[PDB]
Design a protein around this ligand. Structure first.
Ligand code: AXN
Length: 111
């Protein structure tokens, strides 16, 4: 159950959600509100879905965790026009969440 790596991934996920101060990536993009979303985005991602994958043991190395974080950003940049709050927020999350992942990957390395 509890492993140091899974505890580290929990801490890191918390740290990334902290940077999404608007909570706009906290849950899946509401498919009812944007029914064309799945025509552009093959694999939606969000922080709640990441928590679901984490607790279901779907991340066994830091790479796979980071790959899902990257989808939260790249999905948002891909779907939204550049001059939008969403697009700008994904850029901000890319920068701020990148710093989070850098220091968390160091801890995953020495494990
Ligand atoms: C001017 C606006 C910022 C005002 C605004 C517009 C639409 C909507 S919403 O009801 O459509 N909800 C929504 C659509 C998203 C989205 C995230 C959300 N939420 C879920 C709850 C947090 C915001 N994200 C992350 C995307 O990347 C994306 O492309 N979309 C379509 C919500 C707010």
């Amino acid at each position: 159950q509890l492993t140091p790596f899974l505890i580290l991934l929990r801490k890191t996920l918390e740290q990334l959600q902290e940077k999404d101060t608007g909570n706009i990536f906290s849950e899946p993009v509401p498919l009812s509100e944007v029914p064309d979303y799945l025509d552009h985005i093959k694999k939606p991602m969000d922080f709640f879905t990441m928590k679901q994958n984490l607790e279901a043991y779907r991340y066994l190395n830091f790479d796979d965790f980071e790959e899902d974080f990257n989808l939260i950003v790249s999905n948002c940049l891909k779907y939204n026009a550049k001059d939008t709050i969403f697009y700008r927020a994904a850029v901000r999350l890319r920068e701020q969440g990148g710093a989070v992942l850098r220091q968390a990957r160091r801890q995953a390395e020495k494990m």
